[PDB]
Design a protein around this ligand. Structure first.
Ligand SMILES: Nc1ccn([C@@H]2O[C@H](COP(=O)(O)OP(=O)(O)OP(=O)(O)O)[C@@H](O)[C@H]2O)c(=O)n1
Ligand SMILES: [Mg+2]
Ligand SMILES: [Mg+2]
Ligand SMILES: [Zn+2]
Lengths: 59, 250, 54, 217, 85, 435, 652, 219
RNA sequence: CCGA
């Protein structure tokens, strides 16, 4: 339930709701390409981790 | 579940090879169709965090397609949340809904950040909320906060705040519609036909004035202070406001 | 009438009266510069609104 | 046949304990039975202590104002009804209070006997002004249930014997390899601070077991 | 037509086949690749391998025979044994 | 926080959800709606609310109301046979008589619910907004009144029974007429709704927000929409998501808001409590290359802030216009097949007396649609009821230009006579020529 | 009938003949009427059957006017129809009167009791849902009916009717033998588990025993939706009009497990599968047991010819008929050539073409009839042999099934509760089904409460009432007075006085199954007659990953039978455009339909866990370009780059 | 605090009714004890039932036997309603040989020692003049309702294992000059005949006691 | 033809 709070605080503080979506998708693609090894966890998807990291840099 | 093994089949096939269970698509398809308890745990860890678009025809406006996070239920019908039902114009007497799975990562980030159902409260035509209680929650909140002259057990008793009356209701001391005085020092009180005029005044000693209202009793100081305040209410209204207060401030 | 008098013959042909719109577009020799939501859906591109805007 | 787990245990600074319990695995329908019986026995039949009669020297009648104190006698009774304490005697005990202003009056200014014990020491009672001093005596009782005094020597006040303030329970389904559908009982207990939520579970379980053991013949 | 599932299965079969064949000796690997058209798209006879090289076609048949015997080993070759229909 | 010491219905829950979507966001608002959902489910299950046959309580004034109605129809048709009225005003008279008796019985049903049993199940379902209008409760308790043809024509016969007492065979055939209306219209007018929606989508599929400001000085004047003396949309509702183009000044002289300032409901109430005419920025007055800018459009109503670059506002506008017509066309069969009409307001005297002659009013006798000769007001003037009270019996009615008068200059008024009535609006009457 | 009509586009076009109606020799519809002489309904001989000769000539009254028995028409005003106008006249001016109050309605609408207390749209919905009920395993007559059930069962044709007087001599499950007395043995065959057009059961059961007299017209055997000689479409279950914890929220339905374990609402459905061994140019198709790529224990139920046996259990994917066809192209890629070079792997000349069970559709095989041309049969041309397989299954009630009453109150089962969790009565009996009370006053079908209260009075009495519609001719509030008087007489039983409360008539006290506490308000309980409809969830659930495609457009097919995809129409495109979501819309139009390289690349990227590449031009746009070129239009795409225009090739 | 049996009337074997009285208890404790006893007596009591049927010459459930009025489905529904008592926890086997004409009842069942039939007048089938019904069934023990698994020549029955058919209770008050008043619980138990209501009450009592003892012990 |  924290990921919808982070998504709401990431959308509310963005200058454009359509540019922040493309930036989250680009960071999620980088997170998926950098974690290409199989040592991972199913509860932390690349898009969820990108939203978490971008909300943590947002503060 | 049988709908979910079909829609998420290449994502399951990718996970069965990444986990070292099988080695190709043919063994993965064979283990998927043959039935295994490993497939259900694999599908449970595959659909976690993957949003799913739901659609009901006719799609008359924007809220006819919304995104959801799926959980695996057993049976054959799709379980829909009762608050998104006016947005779809959907009741449970024969409606069917289509299901769509986004594949790309840009398409999953768009279903989550732009189309997820917990961000679609307001209508796009008006500014008014679509997501609101209806048809049984409205009746349940109306019965909870109504007046009832028949159910008056422990009426007119004094309680030391909200938690004291909530403890008295769960202990079986008062009814749900009993007239109850509550010590409540806040002034943000809204009533039906709101009253601000004083009905009567009883003077006490030590320069203390006891002001009477229709649904309030205020005791204040002589020059520059307010001491205490009592509010006549029902326990069901106290339950409603405790629900609002623990939902909002968190 | 305002839907059929647009600058794009693909949208006006996909809306209504395909034969007349295509005949006047073929005689006038007009080009479709793919400016709108309906043309990019037929072409198969990103629509120029929303997340495909810039 | 089942294992009981303590999931979390929180304690607020005003001495109020909260503990979540997990019970698994139960058969189909037994979780609702155990949860409803435990909730009813935990809220209705569990002995605790409270104050029953106060006696303030210098009052006219039951509904009046006290000289020098901001709080009149009605909110004095309402503040004494909030007083959380525990006793170890079936016989009456008498607590006393002396205090002088200016300043606020807390629960730590009671020189109550050692057979009773005050749970929340920084419990607000009254405020004083201009060096006026207050003298009162209250009577501690233990019991079960509640007493409501009609129309408002010792001045009998409303009493509530309730060591557990709130019990919630939810049941979760367990689907596994076997065909047996099972149940998981999630229990939440909120206590007054007098006793623990873990030992209040044992008291209610003892009450239910002593209720149902002589029926088996 | 051909389904996308058959396309992806034969592409993964091609990738696993090339990754299995490049583990053995480099000469027999390209002999087996020019024999069945895994690089040229043209299946060739035994003699034309003898014109790709200059050693004639009798050594070529023994080379592909021992390459098939090495790939028919029970150990370290069962990755390809799951594609058996 | 706010305590809300009152009874909760659907509109107040909508107000609470709309308030929680001002300072908290979307997710906290959805969590609040989730908690209110489970609370309402729990206490609706705990209540045990149920509907029975004896739960439908018919008021005991229905007999004398129907008797007064048939006496009015009887004196209407006695007036028709003598020769001083014609057939079309007789038709209009009997139709308006049965419609007024149906509305009077509906009001008496609501009053009898509020008096005897306030915690009645049908009254709780209809009054809280849970499910059901007052038209369906009028058909269950009261009378059904008149039905309608599948083409919109009006039938001639009344239905003097409700669903609790049971209809007869004649009344069942008459109700089957309106059922066929609802079924045929649901099957046949949704194509018209969907064709209008497709045309509206195709006319504005290229209206995207491309730029942030167009830099124009043109503005749109906004007043409260009124049809007669009562409002329809107020000024504060009409200034809800707009930007300002001119500064709003008060009577003291302080500027309430500057130009290019986004208006919310608080600023809209602050503006609408001062003036009556506001100049805003609109897409009608935008100067952009075949599109709209960010400042002339204003707010995104689904989100609560100013719009974003690249929003397909034409698709949202076409869907917003095309959705309610299609939905209402497909749910027209919920009302049975009855005729819905707007009754014109009448202001009567409570007891005996006469009427003050109005000052500053000229009037002409204009033949009413019902047959009685009445005088229509030209310039609006006051009217005061001259009661026979030695201390205080006086009521004043200020007229609308276009009202009708059944009272002469200084004539003595009986006990309960008809006094004044304003005629309907153009769309609120919904009439067309025939033969 | 003004009620029974389709709800779709053909509303008002397809009508239904009324109950007493009849078509004469010239083709016109006529209706019977009793004569009326001097204000007295005659009723001495047969009626008149006026063939619309009653508009310009006669004053006709309906059959619900009050009339004292063997006497005149009471009242001084009689409602008549005259010159296609409704009017009121004196009883001495009435020419004709109707013969029945249900003369205006059809048969299925006459099946509905308390019809005059319901809305007409809900009566239409009740008739339509009554024509959609499945025949159950143990059918049961309604506790409240109207009276046309016996004639409907006699005239449907599902009931074996006797013809002569006689004595029944032999009864078993397949044959009833009777000697007639008033070529001396009449043998009535009884059909057992046949298939209807809608894959439902047509089963008959004997009712008479050996050695009893039989009158002509006596029911000897009753059909599938018929018991006791009368129509029996559903069961009588115990309702409580109350809300549960959101489980009957918006016309959803809460039921108990007793309707599962007591075999209530269990039905039989028989599916039929057919396979033809065709003649191909490359060789004849043969039905055999030797199938390639099929294991060891997938052939246990097949016989020596490759066909299943009677009484075998089959599930989804099991082989019904093994068939092969001689493929003869043999164009193998290098991967298959190398894999058959390594591991042996001799490729056979036939391929698998067996008949298999579809997804779901488990059941028991009951009929395996095989047709061969040299056995005496003659086939469709080009087919050697034809095998027909009948598979039967018992379907219990399920979450997602549709359930309805006779008053247009449909609903979907959303939760099945245990009986210790269901609410119970003050005699301890749990409730079978909880219906939401808010669906009654908005939909305006009040007759279901009359029906449930009368059925509960008849349950506590044991009498099985029968009430004709429009019963308010016998007095004011006749239905209400009948229901409450019968409830009082049922409550006057020596042990059952909790049945009726005079303070609140239709309601009694109901206790909670989970806590034991009574509910705060009394709840209307009763015995309603609920139906199970053909719309079951097994025929509705469908999903596709990747299946077949269309010929020219190369888009996915449509339909459940061909594993088709859902149509993402133009309104869904508008809904995605009103959002942002340009990438969702682009992958929905390209890599999920008619872009074949994008299809293969997207599937390979998802399987190998990599990024899905950028799509290309969809296939249907190139089809449109070629069609516009074949119309004679020089249409082309151009590309500008560094002061240069060039025509692009979209076919690539 | 004593239990006391008030009225215990019986049918042939079909119903065994009993009314037990419990006094004294506290105010809510009567409702706690009554609802826990009702839920356990209706849900968690084990009994015996028929789980399978094999008939000679019958392969599937949609067949017929010549000379029998009922088909295999109505025979399986009649054997589903059979009332038995099994003293062992192992699956037993019952048999039947019947030669028409006549009415075949439950008294004609040749059963082993551990399985005995409660109602011997219970109807099974009707046989004509030249009929021969030879069948064989299986008796098991279970709790609640058994759903069938995936499907030699045994036709499976979704058997129900509830011997107690109805539980009802009311709570009465005792009011005198006897402050802190008490409550009285009366309990109505109806069984099918395979278990007595007193033994069912003892089984529910020690099931509830074994549920609540480790909560007190392990805390 | 039916269902939403
Ligand atoms: N020709 C039709 C018929 C129905 N619908 C859709 O199906 C829904 C029908 O709802 P339904 O449940 O059939 O009826 P209700 O309106 O719910 O009324 P009731 O509850 O009385 O059945 C409508 O909202 C409409 O969106 C449609 O699009 N086109
Ligand atoms: Mg619906
Ligand atoms: Mg509906
Ligand atoms: Zn602009």
């Amino acid at each position: 339930n924290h990921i919808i709070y982070r998504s709401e605080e990431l959308l509310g503080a963005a200058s454009n709701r359509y540019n922040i979506t493309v930036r989250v998708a680009k960071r999620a693609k980088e997170n998926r390409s950098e974690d290409f090894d199989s040592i991972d966890d199913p509860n932390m998807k690349p898009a969820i981790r990108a939203i978490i990291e971008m909300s943590d840099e947002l503060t | 579940r049988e709908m979910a093994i079909e829609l998420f089949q290449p994502f399951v096939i990718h996970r069965l090879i990444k986990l070292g269970i099988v080695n190709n698509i043919k063994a993965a398809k064979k283990l998927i169709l043959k039935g295994d308890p490993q497939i259900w745990s694999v599908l449970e860890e595959v659909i976690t965090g993957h949003p799913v678009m739901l659609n009901r025809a006719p799609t008359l406006h924007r809220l006819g397609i919304q995104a959801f996070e799926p959980i695996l239920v057993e049976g054959r019908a799709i379980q829909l949340h009762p608050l998104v039902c006016p947005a779809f114009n959907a009741d449970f007497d024969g409606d069917q809904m289509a299901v769509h799975v986004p594949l790309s990562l840009e398409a999953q980030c768009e279903a989550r950040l732009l189309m997820l159902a917990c961000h679609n409260v307001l209508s796009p035509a008006t500014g008014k909320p679509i997501v609101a209680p209806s048809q049984d929650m409205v009746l349940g909140c109306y019965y909870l906060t109504a007046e009832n002259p028949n159910a008056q057990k422990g009426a007119g008793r004094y309680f030391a705040g909200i938690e004291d009356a909530l403890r008295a209701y769960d202990h079986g001391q008062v009814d749900l519609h009993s007239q109850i005085w509550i010590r409540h020092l806040d002034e943000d009180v809204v009533t039906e036909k709101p009253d601000t005029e004083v009905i009567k005044t009883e003077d006490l000693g030590d320069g203390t004035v006891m002001k009477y209202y229709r649904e309030r009793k205020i005791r204040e100081g002589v020059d520059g202070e307010i001491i205490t305040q009592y509010i006549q209410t029902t326990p069901g209204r106290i339950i409603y406001n405790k629900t609002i207060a623990e939902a909002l401030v968190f | 009438k305002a839907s059929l008098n647009t600058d794009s013959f693909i949208s006006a042909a996909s809306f209504q009266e395909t034969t007349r719109v295509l005949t006047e577009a073929a005689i006038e020799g007009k080009s479709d510069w793919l400016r709108g939501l309906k043309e990019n859906v037929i072409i198969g591109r990103l629509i120029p609104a929303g997340t495909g805007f810039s | 046949q089942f294992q009981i787990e303590c999931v979390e245990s929180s304690t607020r600074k005003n001495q109020q304990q909260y503990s979540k319990f997990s019970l698994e695995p139960l058969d189909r329908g037994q979780g609702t039975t155990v949860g409803n019986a435990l909730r009813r026995v935990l809220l209705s039949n569990l002995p605790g202590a409270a104050v029953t009669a106060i006696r303030i020297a210098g009052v006219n009648h039951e509904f009046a104002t006290i000289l020098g104190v901001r709080e009149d006698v009605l909110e004095i009774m309402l503040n004494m009804k909030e007083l959380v304490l525990k006793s170890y005697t079936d016989q009456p005990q008498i607590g006393r209070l002396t205090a002088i202003g200016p300043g606020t009056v807390t629960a730590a200014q009671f020189e109550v006997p050692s057979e009773v014990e005050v749970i929340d020491p920084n419990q607000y009672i009254a405020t004083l002004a201009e060096g006026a001093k207050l003298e009162m005596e209250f009577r501690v009782e233990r019991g079960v249930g509640y007493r409501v005094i009609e129309r408002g020597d010792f001045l009998q006040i409303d009493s509530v014997f309730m060591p557990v303030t709130k019990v919630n329970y939810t049941v979760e389904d367990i689907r596994a390899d076997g065909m047996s559908p099972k149940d998981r009982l999630i229990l939440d207990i909120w206590t007054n601070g007098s006793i623990q939520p873990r030992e209040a579970l044992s008291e209610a379980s003892d009450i239910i077991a002593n209720l149902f053991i002589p029926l088996k013949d | 037509g051909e389904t996308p599932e058959d396309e992806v299965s034969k592409n993964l079969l091609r990738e696993d086949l090339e990754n299995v064949l490049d583990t053995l000796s480099p000469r027999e690997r390209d002999v087996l690749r020019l024999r069945y058209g895994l690089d040229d798209g043209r299946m060739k006879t035994l003699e034309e391998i003898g014109q790709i090289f200059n050693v004639t076609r009798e050594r070529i048949r023994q080379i592909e025979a021992k390459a098939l015997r090495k790939l028919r080993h029970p150990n370290r070759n069962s990755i390809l044994k799951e594609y058996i229909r | 926080m706010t305590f809300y010491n009152y009874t909760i219905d659907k509109g107040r829950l909508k107000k609470l959800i709309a308030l929680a979507y001002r300072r908290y966001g979307s997710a906290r608002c959805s969590q609040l709606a989730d908690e209110l959902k489970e609370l309402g489910f729990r206490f609706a299950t705990k209540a045990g609310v149920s509907i029975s046959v004896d739960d439908l309580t018919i008021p005991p004034e229905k007999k004398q109301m129907l008797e007064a109605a048939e006496k009015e129809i009887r004196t209407t048709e006695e007036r028709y046979a003598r020769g001083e009225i014609t057939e079309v005003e007789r038709f209009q008279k009997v139709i308006d008589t049965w419609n007024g008796t149906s509305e009077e019985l509906k009001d008496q049903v609501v009053v009898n619910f509020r008096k005897t049993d306030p915690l009645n199940s049908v009254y709780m379902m209809a009054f809280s907004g849970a499910r059901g209008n007052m038209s369906q409760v009028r058909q269950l308790v009261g009378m059904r009144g008149l039905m309608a043809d599948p083409q919109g024509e009006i039938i001639d016969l009344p239905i003097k029974t409700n669903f609790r007492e049971g209809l007869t065979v004649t009344e069942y055939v008459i109700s089957s007429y309106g059922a066929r209306k609802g079924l045929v219209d649901t099957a046949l007018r949704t194509a018209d709704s969907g064709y209008l929606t497709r045309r509206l989508v195709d006319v504005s599929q290229d209206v995207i927000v491309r730029e942030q400001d167009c830099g124009t000085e043109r503005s749109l004047r906004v007043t409260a929409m009124t049809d007669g003396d009562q409002v329809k949309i107020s000024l504060a509702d009409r200034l809800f998501g707009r930007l300002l183009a001119k500064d709003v000044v008060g009577p003291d002289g302080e500027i309430i808001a500057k130009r290019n300032d986004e208006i919310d409901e608080a600023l809209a109430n602050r503006i609408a409590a001062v003036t009556d005419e506001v100049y805003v920025r609109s897409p009608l007055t935008c100067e952009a290359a075949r599109s709209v800018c960010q400042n002339c459009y204003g707010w995104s109503l689904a989100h609560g802030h100013k719009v974003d670059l690249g929003e397909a506002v034409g698709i949202i506008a076409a869907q917003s216009i095309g959705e309610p017509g299609t939905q209402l066309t497909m749910r027209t069969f919920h009302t049975g097949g009855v005729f819905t009409g707007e009754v014109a307001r009448q202001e009567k005297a409570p007891e005996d007396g006469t009427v003050k002659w109005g000052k500053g009013l000229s009037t002409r006798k204009v033949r009413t649609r019902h047959g009685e000769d009445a005088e229509q007001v030209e310039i609006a003037g006051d009217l005061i009821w001259k009661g026979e009270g030695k201390k205080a019996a006086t009521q004043t009615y200020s007229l609308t230009p276009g009202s009708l008068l059944f009272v002469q200059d200084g004539q003595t008024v009986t006990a309960g006579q008809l006094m004044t009535e304003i005629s309907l609006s153009k769309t609120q009457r919904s009439t067309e020529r025939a033969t | 009938c003004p009620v029974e009509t389709p709800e779709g586009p053909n509303a008002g076009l397809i009508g239904s003949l009324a109950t007493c109606a009849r078509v004469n020799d010239y083709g016109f519809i006529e209706t019977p009427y009793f004569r009326v002489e001097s204000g007295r309904v005659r009723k001495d001989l047969d009626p008149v059957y006026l063939t619309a000769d009653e508009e310009d000539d006669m004053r006709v009254a309906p059959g619900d006017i009050p009339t004292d028995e063997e006497g005149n028409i009471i009242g001084e005003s009689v409602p008549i129809r005259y010159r296609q106008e409704f009017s009121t006249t004196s009883p001495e001016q009435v020419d004709y009167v109707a013969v029945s109050p249900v003369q205006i309605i059809s048969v299925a609408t006459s099946m509905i009791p308390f019809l005059e207390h319901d809305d007409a749209n809900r009566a239409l919905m009740g008739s339509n849902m009554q024509r959609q009920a499945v025949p159950l395993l143990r059918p049961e007559r309604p506790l409240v009916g109207t009276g046309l059930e016996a004639q409907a069962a006699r005239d449907s044709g599902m009931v074996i009717v006797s013809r002569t007087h006689g004595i029944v001599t032999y009864v078993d499950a397949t044959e009833i033998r009777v000697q007639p007395h008033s070529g001396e043995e009449i043998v009535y065959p009884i059909q057992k588990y046949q298939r209807s057009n809608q894959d439902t059961c047509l089963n008959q059961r004997p009712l008479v025993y050996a050695g009893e007299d039989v009158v002509p017209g006596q029911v000897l055997a009753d059909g599938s939706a018929t018991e006791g000689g009368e129509l029996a479409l559903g069961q009588n279950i115990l309702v409580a009009y109350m809300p549960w914890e959101g489980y009957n929220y918006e016309d959803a339905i809460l039921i108990s497990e007793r309707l599962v374990y007591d075999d209530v609402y269990t039905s039989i459905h028989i599916e039929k599968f057919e396979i033809e061994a065709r003649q191909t140019k490359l060789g004849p198709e043969e039905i055999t047991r030797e199938i390639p790529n099929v294991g060891e224990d997938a052939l246990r139920n097949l016989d020596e010819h490759g066909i299943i046996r009677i009484g075998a259990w089959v599930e989804s994917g099991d082989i019904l008929v093994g068939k092969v066809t001689p493929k003869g192209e043999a164009d193998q890629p290098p991967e298959e050539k190398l894999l058959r070079a390594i591991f042996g792997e001799k490729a056979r000349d036939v391929r698998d073409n067996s008949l298999r069970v579809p997804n779901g559709e488990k059941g028991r095989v009951v009929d395996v009839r095989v047709f061969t041309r040299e056995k005496g049969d003659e086939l469709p041309p080009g087919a050697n042999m034809v095998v027909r397989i009948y598979v039967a299954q018992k379907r219990k009630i399920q979450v997602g099934d549709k359930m309805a009453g006779r008053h247009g109150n449909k609903g979907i089962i959303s939760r099945i509760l245990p009986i210790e969790d269901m609410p119970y009565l003050p005699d301890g009996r749990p409730i079978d089904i909880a219906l939401n009370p808010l669906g009654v006053p908005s939909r305006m079908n009040v007759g279901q409460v009359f029906e449930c209260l009368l059925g509960w009075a008849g349950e506590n009495l044991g009498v099985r009432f029968k009430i004709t519609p429009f019963d308010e001719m016998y007095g004011e509030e006749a239905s209400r007075d009948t229901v409450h008087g019968l409830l009082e007489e049922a409550s006057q039983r020596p042990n059952k006085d909790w049945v009726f409360n005079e303070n609140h008539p239709g309601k009694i006290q109901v206790f909670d199954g989970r806590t034991g506490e009574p509910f705060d308000r009394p709840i209307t309980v009763g015995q309603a007659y609920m139906l199970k409809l053909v719309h079951l969830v097994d025929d509705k659930i469908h999903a596709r990953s990747t299946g077949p495609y269309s010929l020219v457009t190369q888009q996915p097919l449509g339909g459940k039978a061909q594993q088709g995809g859902q149509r993402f129409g133009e309104m869904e495109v508008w809904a995605l455009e009103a959002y942002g979501a340009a990438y969702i819309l682009q992958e929905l139009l390209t890599v999920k339909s008619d872009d074949m390289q994008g299809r293969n690349e997207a599937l390979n990227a998802i399987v190998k866990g990599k990024s899905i590449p950028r799509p290309g031009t969809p296939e249907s746009f190139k089809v449109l370009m070629r069609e516009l070129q074949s119309l004679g239009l020089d249409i082309a795409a151009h590309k500008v780059q560094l002061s240069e225009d060039g025509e692009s090739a979209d076919a690539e």
